[PDB]
């Protein structure tokens, strides 16, 4: 269950650290 937190964590941040 904790696996799968982290994975979402990441798709949110995955825009926020983008650059454009």
């Known amino acids: 269950v904790l696996a799968a ?3 979402i964590y990441f798709a ?3 825009p926020a650290i ?3």
Request: aromatic content about 22%.
């Open 12 to 14: 949110a941040l995955s």
């Open 5 to 7: 937190v982290i994975f």
């Open 18 to 20: 983008t650059f454009g």
